[PDB]
Amino acid sequence: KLMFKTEGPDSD
Amino acid sequence: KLMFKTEGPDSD
Amino acid sequence: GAMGSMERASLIQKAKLAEQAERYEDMAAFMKGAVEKGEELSCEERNLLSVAYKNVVGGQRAAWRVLSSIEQKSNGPEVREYREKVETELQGVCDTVLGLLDSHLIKEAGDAESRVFYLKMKGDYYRYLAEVATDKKRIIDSARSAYQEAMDISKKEMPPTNPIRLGLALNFSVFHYEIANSPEEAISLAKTTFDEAMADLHTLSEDSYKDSTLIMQLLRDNLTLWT
Amino acid sequence: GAMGSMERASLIQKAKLAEQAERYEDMAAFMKGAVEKGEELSCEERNLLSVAYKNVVGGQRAAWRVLSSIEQKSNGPEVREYREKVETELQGVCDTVLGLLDSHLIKEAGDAESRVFYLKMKGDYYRYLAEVATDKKRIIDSARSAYQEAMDISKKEMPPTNPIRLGLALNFSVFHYEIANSPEEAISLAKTTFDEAMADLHTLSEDSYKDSTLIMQLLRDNLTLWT
Ligand SMILES: [Cl-]
Ligand SMILES: [Cl-]
Ligand SMILES: [Mg+2]
Ligand SMILES: [Mg+2]
């Protein structure tokens, strides 16, 4: 899936 | 530490 | 719990060590133990809490999406079973974080910086629940309610460049876009947030400027893909 | 154990899914359960077993080295305590793998490809124990003994390009260099292994050639740093 930017660690 | 090459997943 | 016998200061120290070791499940367990000591958390400690659980749930979300994609392509029980296993573990982590916020981080958070931080976290972990939900509507409205309360406070109490306010607006916009199926709300929120921050950058030191523009770049990244 | 109620085939399938999800602790638990069904493992299944535990212990080794480095620089009890926690978990994983090999993978492995694979694994996980040991000598000799038996079989039963034989020689050379403090043995083993493989590449298909030269590159990488 295309994940959009959210706050903090891009851990997924 | 300098880790030398060992077999398989360089998981460390 | 299992951290009940360790000093608060020792739990915080070990959370920092665990972060250095990239041991995020340990990091989360240490910070859970710290929260359960019952004292309010400092700014640094709140960020340790958030970093720890964000990394744990992030790995679970990524695994869940892999498995869900395989499941949908395959539509024996093994794929569904294992997706459910990961999903249940993910929900358990989200429930744990929501339990800490409800008992009793939010109610004891008097300041805007703490209360907004925790309400944003509450929205975030309801949003992660929503990503896997199929009570879906009530989970979504719980996320919305938490984000909205945090937004209301942040607009009254924080400057538009405040990194907490900015990260909140970022995440609420993503909630709108792909959880609430409100893409125009998402776009409007991200645009207004970016513009009002930009107009306030002139008030900031170089260090604060770097903090704010980092999150503004994330708003623009999303807007570029949404428009 | 906890996997006792799941079909062997379902455990193997879920191990493959867990690998795709990068869920290596799950992957290891599934393959532990598969081993405990009591049947010998196929080539693919052995490699699933190895990949799973290699990834788990790899994360633990990396965390242990971070913490050990911090501990040594700092020379309160928290750093030592947390290093010990990780160390104990690492030793538990190694003991688990050694238990599977001893009960009863090695004794039931009749063929060279299986027996060498398992004896190499036995050397590897004693070597990981040795990395954190301070019984140190007996752990080292257990690693040596396992590697040596695997070497003897591999030289009698496998061609010098066999990837299992090559990965064994690679790992035994690293054992020599930094566990046994025998750098000249390490260099000699890596050189002879590389040369004898090179002289046998002409017998291989393109696919086997790719397999063998991949491990030969690792031998040369080490030799470049050792000489
Ligand atoms: Cl399962
Ligand atoms: Cl500890
Ligand atoms: Mg992401
Ligand atoms: Mg390595």
Return left, alpha or beta for D42; rule: phi > 0 is left, psi -120 to 50 is alpha, else beta: beta
CATH of residue D37's domain is 1.20.190.20
Residue C222: nearest ligand to its CA? 3
The experimental resolution of this structure, in angstroms, equals 1.8
What's the gap in Å between the CA of B2 and the closest CA on chain D?
A: 10
* Amino acid sitting at position A10: D
Cβ-contact C162, C154 below 8 angstroms:
yes
* Amino acid sitting at position C49: L
Our count of domains for chain C comes to: 1
Q: How far is the CA of C60 from the centre of ligand 4 (A)?
A: 25
Residue C172: name the closest of C157, C153, C187 by CA.
Answer: C187
C14–D66: do the CB atoms touch at under 8 Å?
A: no
- Please, how many CA atoms are within 13 Å of residue C59, restricted to the half-sphere of its CB? 18
Torsion of CA D167, D170, D171, D175, to 10 degrees: 160
Q: How far is residue C209 from each of residues C147, C151, C198, measured CA to CA in Å? A: 25, 21, 10
Cβ-contact C77, C40 below 8 angstroms:
no
Residue C4: name the closest of C44, C29, C33 by CA.
Answer: C33
Residues on chain C touching A8 (C-beta within 8 angstroms): 50-51, 54, 167
From the list C17, C62, C66, the residue facing D82 with the nearest CB is C17
Asked how this structure was determined, the answer is: X-ray
Which residue range(s) make up the domain with D136?
1-227
Residues 6+ apart with CB under 8 A from C150: C115, C116, C119, C120, C122, C123, C168, C172
Residues 6+ apart with CB under 8 A from C28: C52, C53, C55, C56, C93
Residue C61: nearest ligand to its CA? 3
B4–D177: do the CB atoms touch at under 8 Å?
A: yes
Residues 6+ apart with CB under 8 A from C137: none
Residues 6+ apart with CB under 8 A from D27: D15, D18, D19, D48, D51, D52, D55
Cβ-contact D177, B6 below 8 angstroms:
no
Between CA D79 and CA D95 the distance in angstroms is 24
Q: Which two tokens stand for residue D159?
A: 């061609």
Between CA C197 and CA C211 the distance in angstroms is 12
Burial class of residue D157 (count of CB atoms within 10 Å of its CB; 0-12, 13-18, 19+): middle
Between CA D212 and CA D223 the distance in angstroms is 17
Between CA D52 and CA D28 the distance in angstroms is 5
Nearest residue of C to residue D12, measured between CA atoms = C78
Residue D42: name the closest of D109, D133, D124, D97 by CA.
Answer: D109
Cβ-contact D176, D182 below 8 angstroms:
yes
Residues 6+ apart with CB under 8 A from D2: D29, D33
Residue D85: nearest ligand to its CA? 2
Residues on chain C touching A11 (C-beta within 8 angstroms): 24, 54-59, 62
Which residue in this structure is represented by tokens 């931080």?
Answer: C117
Mutate to test the interface with D, among B1, B2, B3, B5 (most CBs of D within 10 A): B5
Residues 6+ apart with CB under 8 A from C81: D10, D14
Residue D208: name the closest of D159, D143, D154, D172 by CA.
Answer: D159
Between CA C31 and CA A8 the distance in angstroms is 17
Between CA D38 and CA D157 the distance in angstroms is 26
- In SS3 terms, chain D reads as CCCCCCCHHHHHHHHHHHHHCCCHHHHHHHHHHHHCCCCCCCHHHHHHHHHHHHHHHHHHHHHHHHHHHHHHHHCCCHHHHHHHHHHHHHHHHHHHHHHHHHHHHHHHCCCHHHHHHHHHHHHHHHHHHHHHCCCHHHHHHHHHHHHHHHHHHHHHHCCCCCHHHHHHHHHHHHHHHHHCCCHHHHHHHHHHHHHHHHCCHHHCCHHHHHHHHHHHHHHHHHHHHHC
Burial class of residue D4 (count of CB atoms within 10 Å of its CB; 0-12, 13-18, 19+): exposed
Can you spell out the DSSP letters for A1-12? --PPP-SS----
